[PDB]
Amino acid sequence: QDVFTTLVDLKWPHTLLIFTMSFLCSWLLFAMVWWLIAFAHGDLAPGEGTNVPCVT
Amino acid sequence: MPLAFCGTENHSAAYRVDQGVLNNGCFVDALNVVPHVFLLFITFPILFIG
Ligand SMILES: CCCCCCCCCCCCCCCCCC(=O)OC[C@H](COP(=O)(O)OC[C@H](N)C(=O)O)OC(=O)CCCCCCCCCCCCCCCCC
Ligand SMILES: CCCCCCCCCCC(=O)O[C@H](COC(=O)CCCCC)COP(=O)(O)OCCN
Ligand SMILES: *[C@@H]1O[C@H](CO)[C@@H](O[C@@H]2O[C@H](CO)[C@@H](O)[C@H](O)[C@H]2NC(C)=O)[C@H](O)[C@H]1NC(C)=O
Numbered sequence: 392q393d394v395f396t397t398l399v400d401l402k403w404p405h406t407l408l409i410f411t412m413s414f415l416c417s418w419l420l421f422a423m424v425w426w427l428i429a430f431a432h433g434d435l436a437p438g439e440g441t442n443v444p445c446v447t
Numbered sequence: 448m449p450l451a452f453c454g455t456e457n458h459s460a461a462y463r464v465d466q467g468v469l470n471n472g473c474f475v476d477a478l479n480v481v482p483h484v485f486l487l488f489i490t491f492p493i494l495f496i497g
Binding site: 416 | 463468482488493
Protein backbone atom coordinates (compact mmCIF):
# COMPACT_ATOMS: atom_id res chain seq x y z
CA GLN A 392 0.00 0.00 0.00
CA ASP A 393 2.99 2.31 0.59
CA VAL A 394 3.84 2.09 -3.11
CA PHE A 395 5.69 5.40 -3.30
CA THR A 396 7.72 4.59 -0.19
CA THR A 397 8.48 1.14 -1.61
CA LEU A 398 9.60 2.51 -4.98
CA VAL A 399 12.15 4.78 -3.29
CA ASP A 400 13.46 2.00 -1.03
CA LEU A 401 14.31 -0.14 -4.06
CA LYS A 402 17.88 -0.13 -5.33
CA TRP A 403 18.65 1.96 -8.39
CA PRO A 404 18.97 -0.99 -10.84
CA HIS A 405 15.50 -2.12 -9.75
CA THR A 406 14.21 1.43 -10.14
CA LEU A 407 15.52 1.48 -13.71
CA LEU A 408 13.60 -1.72 -14.46
CA ILE A 409 10.39 -0.27 -13.00
CA PHE A 410 11.06 3.02 -14.78
CA THR A 411 11.50 1.10 -18.04
CA MET A 412 8.54 -1.24 -17.55
CA SER A 413 6.15 1.52 -16.47
CA PHE A 414 6.84 3.38 -19.73
CA LEU A 415 7.28 0.43 -22.09
CA CYS A 416 3.97 -1.03 -20.93
CA SER A 417 2.23 2.34 -21.30
CA TRP A 418 3.61 2.78 -24.82
CA LEU A 419 2.65 -0.78 -25.76
CA LEU A 420 -0.78 -0.73 -24.08
CA PHE A 421 -1.75 2.22 -26.28
CA ALA A 422 0.10 0.67 -29.22
CA MET A 423 -2.58 -2.02 -29.24
CA VAL A 424 -5.23 0.71 -28.97
CA TRP A 425 -3.98 2.70 -31.96
CA TRP A 426 -3.45 -0.46 -34.01
CA LEU A 427 -6.95 -1.71 -33.23
CA ILE A 428 -8.68 1.64 -33.81
CA ALA A 429 -7.10 1.95 -37.25
CA PHE A 430 -8.04 -1.69 -37.83
CA ALA A 431 -11.71 -1.11 -36.98
CA HIS A 432 -11.83 2.16 -38.92
CA GLY A 433 -10.65 0.32 -42.02
CA ASP A 434 -7.71 2.52 -43.04
CA LEU A 435 -5.31 -0.34 -42.26
CA ALA A 436 -6.22 -2.02 -45.56
CA PRO A 437 -3.33 -1.57 -48.03
CA GLY A 438 -5.33 0.19 -50.73
CA GLU A 439 -6.02 3.56 -52.29
CA GLY A 440 -6.87 6.16 -49.68
CA THR A 441 -10.48 6.66 -50.73
CA ASN A 442 -11.41 7.44 -47.12
CA VAL A 443 -9.67 9.82 -44.71
CA PRO A 444 -7.44 7.80 -42.35
CA CYS A 445 -8.25 7.84 -38.65
CA VAL A 446 -4.57 8.44 -37.82
CA THR A 447 -2.44 9.08 -40.89
CA MET B 448 7.11 -10.85 -47.29
CA PRO B 449 6.89 -9.17 -43.87
CA LEU B 450 5.02 -10.39 -40.79
CA ALA B 451 1.28 -9.75 -41.15
CA PHE B 452 -1.06 -10.41 -38.24
CA CYS B 453 -3.97 -11.36 -40.49
CA GLY B 454 -3.55 -13.34 -43.68
CA THR B 455 -1.04 -11.65 -45.96
CA GLU B 456 -2.44 -13.74 -48.82
CA ASN B 457 -4.85 -12.50 -51.50
CA HIS B 458 -2.98 -9.19 -51.85
CA SER B 459 -3.54 -8.47 -48.14
CA ALA B 460 -7.32 -8.23 -48.48
CA ALA B 461 -8.03 -9.67 -45.01
CA TYR B 462 -8.05 -6.23 -43.35
CA ARG B 463 -11.20 -5.08 -45.16
CA VAL B 464 -13.94 -4.27 -42.67
CA ASP B 465 -17.06 -4.30 -44.81
CA GLN B 466 -20.22 -5.91 -43.42
CA GLY B 467 -19.30 -4.96 -39.85
CA VAL B 468 -15.93 -5.21 -38.14
CA LEU B 469 -17.03 -8.17 -36.01
CA ASN B 470 -17.48 -10.19 -39.22
CA ASN B 471 -13.77 -9.75 -40.01
CA GLY B 472 -12.39 -13.13 -38.97
CA CYS B 473 -9.12 -11.45 -38.04
CA PHE B 474 -10.49 -8.47 -36.12
CA VAL B 475 -12.25 -10.72 -33.60
CA ASP B 476 -8.86 -12.37 -33.16
CA ALA B 477 -7.41 -8.91 -32.53
CA LEU B 478 -10.13 -8.16 -29.97
CA ASN B 479 -8.95 -11.22 -28.02
CA VAL B 480 -5.40 -9.88 -27.71
CA VAL B 481 -6.37 -6.69 -25.82
CA PRO B 482 -7.65 -8.43 -22.64
CA HIS B 483 -4.27 -10.13 -22.30
CA VAL B 484 -1.99 -7.17 -23.05
CA PHE B 485 -4.14 -5.20 -20.60
CA LEU B 486 -3.29 -7.55 -17.73
CA LEU B 487 0.26 -8.19 -18.96
CA PHE B 488 0.91 -4.44 -18.64
CA ILE B 489 -1.15 -3.70 -15.51
CA THR B 490 0.43 -6.40 -13.34
CA PHE B 491 4.02 -6.30 -14.63
CA PRO B 492 4.68 -2.96 -12.87
CA ILE B 493 2.83 -4.25 -9.80
CA LEU B 494 4.71 -7.56 -9.68
CA PHE B 495 8.08 -5.93 -10.38
CA ILE B 496 7.63 -3.66 -7.36
CA GLY B 497 7.16 -6.78 -5.25
C1 LIG C 1 19.80 -11.99 -5.55
C2 LIG C 1 20.37 -11.05 -6.60
C3 LIG C 1 19.70 -9.68 -6.60
C4 LIG C 1 20.31 -8.71 -7.61
C5 LIG C 1 19.69 -7.32 -7.56
C6 LIG C 1 20.38 -6.31 -8.46
C7 LIG C 1 20.10 -6.50 -9.95
C8 LIG C 1 21.04 -5.67 -10.82
C9 LIG C 1 20.84 -5.86 -12.32
C10 LIG C 1 22.14 -5.64 -13.09
C11 LIG C 1 22.00 -4.75 -14.33
C12 LIG C 1 21.71 -3.30 -13.96
C13 LIG C 1 22.25 -2.27 -14.95
C14 LIG C 1 22.15 -0.86 -14.38
C15 LIG C 1 23.09 0.15 -15.03
C16 LIG C 1 23.02 1.51 -14.35
C17 LIG C 1 23.25 1.43 -12.85
C18 LIG C 1 24.71 1.46 -12.47
O1 LIG C 1 25.63 1.44 -13.25
O2 LIG C 1 24.88 1.52 -11.16
C19 LIG C 1 24.89 2.80 -10.55
C20 LIG C 1 23.80 2.90 -9.51
C21 LIG C 1 23.27 1.56 -9.01
O3 LIG C 1 24.22 0.88 -8.23
P1 LIG C 1 23.80 0.17 -6.81
O4 LIG C 1 25.01 0.00 -5.94
O5 LIG C 1 23.00 -1.03 -7.21
O6 LIG C 1 22.87 1.36 -6.20
C22 LIG C 1 21.99 1.18 -5.11
C23 LIG C 1 21.75 2.49 -4.38
N1 LIG C 1 23.01 3.03 -3.91
C24 LIG C 1 20.68 2.25 -3.28
O7 LIG C 1 20.80 1.19 -2.63
O8 LIG C 1 19.80 3.11 -3.13
O9 LIG C 1 22.74 3.70 -10.07
C25 LIG C 1 22.80 5.03 -9.98
O10 LIG C 1 23.67 5.63 -9.41
C26 LIG C 1 21.63 5.66 -10.68
C27 LIG C 1 22.01 6.50 -11.89
C28 LIG C 1 21.02 6.30 -13.04
C29 LIG C 1 21.39 7.08 -14.29
C30 LIG C 1 21.67 6.18 -15.49
C31 LIG C 1 20.58 6.26 -16.55
C32 LIG C 1 20.15 4.90 -17.08
C33 LIG C 1 18.66 4.82 -17.38
C34 LIG C 1 18.24 3.49 -18.00
C35 LIG C 1 19.04 3.14 -19.24
C36 LIG C 1 18.73 1.76 -19.81
C37 LIG C 1 17.44 1.71 -20.62
C38 LIG C 1 17.15 0.34 -21.20
C39 LIG C 1 15.83 0.26 -21.96
C40 LIG C 1 15.61 -1.08 -22.65
C41 LIG C 1 14.34 -1.12 -23.49
C42 LIG C 1 14.19 -2.41 -24.28
C1 LIG D 1 -11.16 1.82 -24.95
C2 LIG D 1 -9.91 1.98 -25.81
C3 LIG D 1 -10.20 1.80 -27.30
C4 LIG D 1 -10.56 0.38 -27.71
C5 LIG D 1 -10.29 0.10 -29.18
C6 LIG D 1 -11.38 0.59 -30.13
C7 LIG D 1 -12.49 -0.43 -30.33
C8 LIG D 1 -12.99 -0.53 -31.76
C9 LIG D 1 -13.83 -1.78 -31.99
C10 LIG D 1 -15.33 -1.51 -32.01
C11 LIG D 1 -16.16 -2.75 -31.81
O1 LIG D 1 -16.08 -3.48 -30.86
O2 LIG D 1 -17.00 -2.95 -32.82
C12 LIG D 1 -18.28 -2.31 -32.82
C13 LIG D 1 -19.26 -3.29 -32.22
O3 LIG D 1 -18.96 -3.41 -30.83
C14 LIG D 1 -19.97 -3.66 -30.00
O4 LIG D 1 -21.12 -3.71 -30.35
C15 LIG D 1 -19.49 -3.87 -28.59
C16 LIG D 1 -19.00 -5.29 -28.31
C17 LIG D 1 -17.60 -5.54 -28.86
C18 LIG D 1 -16.51 -4.96 -27.97
C19 LIG D 1 -16.30 -5.72 -26.66
C20 LIG D 1 -18.69 -1.90 -34.22
O5 LIG D 1 -19.93 -2.48 -34.54
P1 LIG D 1 -20.38 -2.53 -36.12
O6 LIG D 1 -21.83 -2.15 -36.25
O7 LIG D 1 -19.90 -3.81 -36.74
O8 LIG D 1 -19.42 -1.27 -36.54
C21 LIG D 1 -18.97 -1.17 -37.88
C22 LIG D 1 -20.12 -1.43 -38.83
N1 LIG D 1 -21.18 -0.44 -38.67
C1 LIG E 1 -9.37 -11.77 -52.81
O1 LIG E 1 -9.69 -10.42 -53.07
C2 LIG E 1 -10.29 -10.24 -54.36
C3 LIG E 1 -10.98 -8.89 -54.33
O2 LIG E 1 -11.79 -8.75 -53.17
C4 LIG E 1 -11.24 -11.39 -54.70
O3 LIG E 1 -10.57 -12.32 -55.53
C5 LIG E 1 -11.33 -12.65 -56.71
O4 LIG E 1 -12.73 -12.34 -56.57
C6 LIG E 1 -13.50 -12.64 -57.74
C7 LIG E 1 -14.91 -12.18 -57.46
O5 LIG E 1 -15.62 -11.91 -58.66
C8 LIG E 1 -13.42 -14.14 -58.05
O6 LIG E 1 -14.12 -14.40 -59.25
C9 LIG E 1 -11.96 -14.57 -58.19
O7 LIG E 1 -11.89 -15.98 -58.34
C10 LIG E 1 -11.16 -14.15 -56.96
N1 LIG E 1 -9.76 -14.50 -57.11
C11 LIG E 1 -8.97 -14.81 -56.08
C12 LIG E 1 -7.55 -15.15 -56.42
O8 LIG E 1 -9.38 -14.82 -54.92
C13 LIG E 1 -11.77 -12.09 -53.45
O9 LIG E 1 -12.64 -11.21 -52.73
C14 LIG E 1 -10.64 -12.55 -52.52
N2 LIG E 1 -10.42 -13.98 -52.66
C15 LIG E 1 -9.90 -14.73 -51.68
C16 LIG E 1 -9.74 -16.19 -51.99
O10 LIG E 1 -9.58 -14.26 -50.60
